[PDB]
Amino acid sequence: SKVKVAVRVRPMNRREIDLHTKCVVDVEANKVILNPIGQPKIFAYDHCFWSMDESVREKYAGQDDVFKCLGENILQNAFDGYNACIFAYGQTGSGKSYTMMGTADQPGLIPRLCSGLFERTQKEENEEQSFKVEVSYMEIYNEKVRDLLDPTLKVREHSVLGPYVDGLSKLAVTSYKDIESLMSEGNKSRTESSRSHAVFKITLTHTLYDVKSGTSGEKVGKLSLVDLAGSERSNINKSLTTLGLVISALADQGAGKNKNKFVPYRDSVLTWLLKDSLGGNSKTAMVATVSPAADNYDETLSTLRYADRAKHIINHAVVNEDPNARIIRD
Ligand SMILES: Nc1ncnc2c1ncn2[C@@H]1O[C@H](COP(=O)(O)OP(=O)(O)NP(=O)(O)O)[C@@H](O)[C@H]1O
Ligand SMILES: [Mg+2]
Ligand SMILES: [Mg+2]
């Protein structure tokens, strides 16, 4: 399938309203219209999320709509044993962290995903099937990896299971409250700059039992939830710069231009780690966050064009299940 792309326009904030900064971003169904400060530029996406204002009610509905449209499907992907990824991309201040983690009063994608995961595993556990959940949480800053769950580490690409951070804590968790204290520990530990990338990973291992045979098999879904550094324009930006190159090359592939243009996955820590998320074995969505007002026109236009190329990336997601699991279905 193609990478799924959504644009989320955050509302005009207090400064932009106080100072009468012109709003240049309109949302029209699944299209974004960027008006000039000559002609309007129109971009089409899979979803567009918009907010009328920052009233408490519009905040509640905004986080809810994002989860309903993007989180439920990614959660279902993991219960089907797919690898899946949501990454948030856009300039500083545009709403990346608000979309992924949210706030205490307006929780975002990650807490909602974690809550729904344990509610479903608990509802669905029985004597024919059990679930194991593990989490990891890490940050890339200045091309170095740090374990946010540990009070440094290097990337390796496994021959079958893909790129991974070797030495990274991968913790078994049995309830939402367990994962919540880890999220809270990680979020406090995050370095506080717009130049760091944070990767939250959940591995869902579904074991199926054939009590007549005495056999069992595992189907494994993996969720990568990525809150990127701000897209606004050496070793400190290398990951972001290389992500742009990777997305542009892959978009060119997924249209016919350059069958084997060089996709520089290994030129940065971030793109090597997300190598399967982009063009590989993954159900992947991008959430491109943009600011609404005239003062960010060019950065918005850049984010919109990058999101527009991402939707041409072709992925190849297959179910990750061992031999027994496949047959135990029927
Ligand atoms: N969709 C939204 N609705 C309401 N308020 C929002 C929304 N998006 C962002 N905000 C507000 O704007 C602030 C900035 O958003 P935030 O998610 O922190 O931006 P960011 O893209 O992560 N910046 P950065 O980490 O520096 O690259 C948030 O703390 C919220 O108060
Ligand atoms: Mg997969
Ligand atoms: Mg942020």
The DSSP element (H or E) to which 173 belongs, if any, is strand 171-173
The DSSP element (H or E) to which 180 belongs, if any, is helix 176-189
Q: Which ligand is nearest to the CA of 187?
A: 3
For residue 112 the two structure tokens come to 């909602």
Q: Residue 206: which of 126, 135, 280 has the closest Cα?
A: 126
Dist. CA 330 → ligand 3 center (Å) = 45
For residue 102 the two structure tokens come to 């949210």
For residue 136 the two structure tokens come to 């990891």
Dist. CA 26 → ligand 1 center (Å) = 18
**Can you name the residues that pair with 217 across neighbouring β-strands?**
208
Residues in the chain: 330
CA–CA gap between residue 178 and residue 133 (Å, rounded) = 11
Q: Which ligand is nearest to the CA of 222?
A: 2
Q: How big is the CA angle at 207 (ends 200 and 182), to the nearest 5 degrees?
A: 25
Output the CA–CA distances (angstroms, integers) from residue 23 to 37, 85, 95, in the order listed: 9, 31, 16
Cβ atoms 137, 98 nearer than 8 A: no
CA–CA gap between residue 40 and residue 34 (Å, rounded) = 6
Which residues contact residue 184 at a Cβ distance below 8 angstroms, ignoring those fewer than 6 apart? none
254 marked ligand binding residue: no
**Tokens 């899946």, residue located:** 84
Output the CA–CA distances (angstroms, integers) from residue 268 to 1, 220, 264, 274, 318, in the order listed: 25, 27, 8, 10, 26
93 marked ligand binding residue: yes
For residue 190 the two structure tokens come to 């995050």
SS3 content of the chain, % helix, strand, coil (to 5): 35, 30, 35
For residue 302 the two structure tokens come to 């850049």
Cβ atoms 34, 25 nearer than 8 A: yes
Which residues contact residue 222 at a Cβ distance below 8 angstroms, ignoring those fewer than 6 apart? 78, 83, 84, 201, 202, 203, 204, 320
Could you say which of 3.40.850.10, 3.30.70.100, 3.30.300.280, 3.40.30.10 is the CATH number of the domain covering 1-330? Answer: 3.40.850.10
CA–CA gap between residue 112 and residue 66 (Å, rounded) = 10
Q: How big is the CA angle at 102 (ends 313 and 135), to the nearest 5 degrees?
A: 70
Q: Residue 79: which of 316, 266, 321 has the closest Cα?
A: 321
DSSP state, residue 143: T
The DSSP element (H or E) to which 307 belongs, if any, is helix 297-310
Cβ atoms 66, 109 nearer than 8 A: yes
Residues lining ligand 1, CB < 6 A? 8, 10-11, 51, 54, 59, 62, 90, 92-98, 194, 230, 289
**Can you name the residues that pair with 156 across neighbouring β-strands?**
164
What torsion do the CA atoms of 233, 266, 88, 1 make, to the nearest 10 degrees? 130
| 235, burial (CB in 10 Å: exposed 0-12, middle 13-18, buried 19+) | exposed
CA–CA gap between residue 243 and residue 267 (Å, rounded) = 9
CA–CA gap between residue 307 and residue 26 (Å, rounded) = 16
129 marked ligand binding residue: no
Residue 12's CB is within 10 A of a number of other CB atoms, namely: 19
DSSP string covering 3-62, please? PEEEEEEPPP-HHHHHTTPPB-EEEETTEEEE----PPEEEE-SEEE--S-S-HHHHHHH
Residue 192's CB is within 10 A of a number of other CB atoms, namely: 6
Q: How big is the CA angle at 232 (ends 164 and 94), to the nearest 5 degrees?
A: 90
Cβ atoms 62, 203 nearer than 8 A: no
Which residues contact residue 150 at a Cβ distance below 8 angstroms, ignoring those fewer than 6 apart? 169
**Can you name the residues that pair with 207 across neighbouring β-strands?**
130, 218
DSSP-derived pairing of the beta strands 144-147 and 129-141: antiparallel
Dist. CA 107 → ligand 1 center (Å) = 12
For residue 106 the two structure tokens come to 């307006």
Terminal-residue alpha carbon distance, the chain: 26
Atom 16, ligand 1: residue with shortest CA distance: 95
Whether the CA torsion 107, 163, 2, 41 is positive or negative: it is: positive
Cβ atoms 67, 115 nearer than 8 A: no
For residue 12 the two structure tokens come to 């005009």
For residue 47 the two structure tokens come to 């979803």
Helix (H/G/I), strand (E/B), else coil: 146: strand
Phi, psi of 67 (to 5 degrees): -65, -45
Output the CA–CA distances (angstroms, integers) from residue 54 to 110, 182, 217, 288, in the order listed: 21, 29, 48, 19
Phi, psi of 135 (to 5 degrees): -130, 150
Cβ atoms 190, 141 nearer than 8 A: no
What torsion do the CA atoms of 57, 59, 63, 64 make, to the nearest 10 degrees? 10
CA–CA gap between residue 35 and residue 24 (Å, rounded) = 5
For residue 234 the two structure tokens come to 């050496």
